[PDB]
């Protein structure tokens, strides 16, 4: 399952980067070019969403009242619910990832030994498992990169 592997990596690295504030220097490995452009696209638009919706995000983080790194059950139900209307687009996808990073940041403050892993896995699981065929049709992360490609 390469789609899942690649997705978990891009999403995990971004969240970890956001939480620790430190970039990771490791070869992405497989389809590395796409993954890096994805991470780059993800930095640009991802940070933008958090900046531009700081007020809404702060409120959402507050109602989520996430207790620990493992308490991702509620967020999982939230994300599933977001797509429950049958609408699928990159805007929603990147917004969920951006909020994921926003949550990952808050987790650090309360304890610094928090793997962002459980959070990244919860997000990746929803996207790749419930939107499997939609992603494949979009050429996966190249579609992501392409959609958010600005001139």
């Amino acid at each position: 399952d390469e789609l899942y592997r690649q997705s978990l990596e891009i999403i995990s690295r971004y969240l970890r980067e956001q939480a620790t504030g430190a970039k990771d220097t490791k070869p992405m490995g497989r389809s590395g070019a796409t993954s890096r452009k994805a991470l780059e696209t993800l930095r640009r638009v991802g940070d933008g969403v958090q900046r531009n919706h700081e007020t809404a995000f702060q409120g959402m983080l507050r109602k989520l009242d996430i207790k620990n790194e493992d308490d991702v059950k509620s967020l999982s139900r939230v994300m599933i619910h977001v797509f429950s209307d049958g609408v699928t687009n990159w805007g929603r996808i990147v917004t969920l990832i951006s909020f994921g990073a926003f949550v990952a940041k808050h987790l650090k403050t309360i304890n610094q030994e928090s793997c962002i892993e459980p959070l990244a896995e919860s997000i990746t699981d929803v996207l790749v498992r419930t939107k499997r065929d939609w992603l494949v049709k979009q050429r996966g992360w190249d579609g992501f990169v392409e959609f958010f490609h600005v001139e």
Binding site: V45, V49, H53, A56, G59, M60, K63, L64, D65, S74, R77, V78, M79, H81, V82, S84, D85, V87, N89, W90, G91, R92, I93, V94, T95, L96, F99, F147, F148, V150
Partner: peptide, 22 residues
Amino acid sequence: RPEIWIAQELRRIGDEENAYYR
């Protein structure tokens, strides 16, 4: 109820972001 509100925000923001880049 809180989770429904959270879903509403993410969806509103998601579609708004989608339109912008679209």
